[PDB]
Design an enzyme around this catalytic site. Structure first.
Site, PDB file in Angstrom:
ATOM      1  N   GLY A 152      39.038  43.734  45.540  1.00 24.77           N
ATOM      2  CA  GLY A 152      40.437  43.686  45.150  1.00 24.77           C
ATOM      3  C   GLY A 152      40.664  42.460  44.295  1.00 24.77           C
ATOM      4  N   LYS A 154      53.186  45.773  53.149  1.00 27.87           N
ATOM      5  CA  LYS A 154      53.018  46.920  52.255  1.00 27.87           C
ATOM      6  C   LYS A 154      51.664  47.576  52.517  1.00 27.87           C
ATOM      7  CE  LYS A 154      51.499  43.674  48.655  1.00 27.87           C
ATOM      8  NZ  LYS A 154      51.728  43.118  47.284  1.00 27.87           N
ATOM      9  N   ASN A 189      48.204  45.837  51.935  1.00 27.14           N
ATOM     10  CA  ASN A 189      47.801  44.736  52.793  1.00 27.14           C
ATOM     11  C   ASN A 189      47.338  45.191  54.160  1.00 27.14           C
ATOM     12  OD1 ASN A 189      48.266  42.880  50.863  1.00 27.14           O
ATOM     13  ND2 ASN A 189      50.129  42.005  51.762  1.00 27.14           N
ATOM     14  N   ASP A 246      55.046  39.924  53.456  1.00 27.54           N
ATOM     15  CA  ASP A 246      54.443  40.764  52.405  1.00 27.54           C
ATOM     16  C   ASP A 246      53.917  42.063  52.981  1.00 27.54           C
ATOM     17  OD1 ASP A 246      51.777  40.421  49.921  1.00 27.54           O
ATOM     18  OD2 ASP A 246      53.742  41.395  49.757  1.00 27.54           O
ATOM     19  N   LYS A 255      37.843  35.830  50.124  1.00 25.55           N
ATOM     20  CA  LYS A 255      38.957  35.651  49.205  1.00 25.55           C
ATOM     21  C   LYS A 255      38.700  34.369  48.426  1.00 25.55           C
ATOM     22  CE  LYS A 255      44.029  35.588  48.932  1.00 25.55           C
ATOM     23  NZ  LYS A 255      45.333  35.690  49.668  1.00 25.55           N
ATOM     24  N   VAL A 294      36.487  44.857  56.665  1.00 24.00           N
ATOM     25  CA  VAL A 294      37.094  46.039  57.256  1.00 24.00           C
ATOM     26  C   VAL A 294      36.792  47.195  56.321  1.00 24.00           C
ATOM     27  CG1 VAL A 294      39.203  47.105  58.174  1.00 24.00           C
ATOM     28  CG2 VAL A 294      38.918  44.591  58.227  1.00 24.00           C
TER      29      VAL A 294
HETATM   30  N1  LIG Z   1      37.827  43.486  54.502  1.00 22.02           N
HETATM   31  C1  LIG Z   1      38.793  42.660  54.191  1.00 22.02           C
HETATM   32  N2  LIG Z   1      39.200  41.770  55.062  1.00 22.02           N
HETATM   33  C2  LIG Z   1      39.453  42.771  52.878  1.00 22.02           C
HETATM   34  C3  LIG Z   1      39.068  43.759  51.978  1.00 22.02           C
HETATM   35  C4  LIG Z   1      39.815  44.006  50.842  1.00 22.02           C
HETATM   36  C5  LIG Z   1      40.964  43.274  50.575  1.00 22.02           C
HETATM   37  C6  LIG Z   1      41.863  43.664  49.452  1.00 22.02           C
HETATM   38  F1  LIG Z   1      42.846  44.491  49.847  1.00 22.02           F
HETATM   39  F2  LIG Z   1      42.446  42.621  48.876  1.00 22.02           F
HETATM   40  F3  LIG Z   1      41.217  44.296  48.495  1.00 22.02           F
HETATM   41  C7  LIG Z   1      41.313  42.247  51.443  1.00 22.02           C
HETATM   42  C8  LIG Z   1      40.567  41.994  52.577  1.00 22.02           C
END
Ligand SMILES: NC(=[NH2+])c1ccc(C(F)(F)F)cc1
Lengths: 13, 350
Positions: B50, B168, B171, B166, B72, B123
């Protein structure tokens, strides 16, 4: 009609 | 009355909630008061999962253990605006202190000359957003299963004086058991009364945010109304091409519902999508219990949801560890680390 794709959040409108 | 026996069980249940939240706040505070657990070369970077304005989330693989994580990455030189910076500090500190079955677990955080890094549990089931857009809309039982998890998650967060800000489908990730993981805390904040930042995602903003009013945790209950509407309809209630048009619709005080919405659902949503804060569910004398005891949730076993005893409506397919098939594809850009530290003083607390 509206936004169908992923929507970005705004930190300070 | 509506309840016969059943009233005593519900009351005892409510008293047990209080007991749980008191213990949860003691544990949170211990970590909040007394909180560089890795470095970048400990991870193989696999795929972008993402992207946003300030960086990206990547699937990574821990070299030593072989465990997969979501990393992230925030470019310190894109995190320029004052509230962009404070919000990054909120996010890290909150994530390291919370503990709840539907909140993603932070594993490591660290920084270098160019970027900030938060490494959380991966996840693999993908975003609710993409499943919803693919199928169109969720049936009411399916939407209600997800909504119940959000209600419990917000009950937990709000009891710690945390506002999420936030909500939605983007998320909300779906885990291997079909349950929700809330995964981005970039707008979350500890707030004992009001706060004033104009922030969030346009379609999900409460009117008091748009109107530049000091606001409180009730903005999360408004956003829950937007989420339930979007899950059950396939599109949100205040729907327009440009943010300014969305804002005008939100403030008007008018919502129209699809003809397939049950009357119980419309009643709940009219009380969540309530512009008058003296009338909005979640914000009244009885707090979250006005929501949990609403007729639309009559079939919901709140404790069983928390304990993850309920069969999920949808289980994502997983081909094995590291599988990214439930995520969309994004442009891959190299992660470049500058030779000179950037924005050191502005992120000394991270
Ligand atoms: N597996 C994760 N904790 C994870 C995966 C994708 C995103 C996204 F939605 F930003 F793409 C954020 C977190």
């Amino acid at each position: 009609a509206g936004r169908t794709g992923r929507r970005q959040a705004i930190h300070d409108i | 009355g509506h309840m016969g026996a059943a009233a005593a069980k519900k009351g005892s249940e409510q008293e047990s909630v209080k007991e749980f939240l008191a213990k949860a706040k003691e544990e949170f505070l211990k970590k909040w008061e007394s909180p560089n657990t890795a470095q970048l070369d400990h991870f193989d970077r696999i795929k972008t999962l993402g992207t946003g304005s300030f960086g990206r989330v990547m699937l990574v693989k821990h070299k030593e253990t072989g465990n997969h994580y979501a990393m992230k990455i925030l470019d310190k030189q894109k995190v320029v605006k004052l509230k962009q910076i404070e919000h990054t500090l909120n996010e890290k500190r909150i994530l390291q202190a919370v503990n709840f079955p539907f909140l993603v677990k932070l594993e490591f955080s660290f920084k270098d000359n160019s970027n900030l890094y938060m490494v959380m549990e991966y996840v693999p089931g993908g975003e609710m957003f993409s499943h919803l857009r693919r199928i169109g809309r969720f049936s009411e039982p399916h939407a209600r299963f997800y909504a119940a998890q959000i209600v419990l998650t917000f009950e937990y967060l709000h009891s710690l004086d945390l506002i999420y800000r936030d909500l939605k489908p983007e998320n909300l990730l779906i885990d291997q058991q079909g349950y929700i993981q809330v995964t981005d805390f970039g707008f979350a904040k500890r707030v004992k009364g009001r706060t004033w930042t104009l922030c969030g995602t346009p379609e999900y903003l409460a009117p008091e945010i748009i109107l530049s009013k000091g606001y409180n945790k009730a903005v999360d209950w408004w956003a829950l109304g937007v989420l339930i509407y979007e899950m059950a309809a396939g599109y949100p209630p205040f729907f327009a091409d440009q943010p300014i048009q969305i804002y005008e619709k939100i403030v008007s005080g008018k919502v129209r519902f699809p003809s397939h919405f049950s009357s119980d659902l419309k009643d709940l949503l009219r009380n969540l999508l309530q512009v008058d804060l003296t009338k909005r569910f979640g914000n009244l004398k009885n707090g979250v219990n006005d929501i949990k005891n609403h007729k639309w949730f009559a079939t919901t076993d709140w404790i069983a949801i928390y304990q993850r005893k309920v069969e999920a409506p949808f289980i994502p397919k997983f081909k094995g560890p590291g599988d990214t098939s439930n995520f969309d594809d994004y442009e891959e850009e190299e992660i470049r680390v500058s030779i000179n530290e950037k924005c050191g003083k502005e992120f000394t607390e991270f």
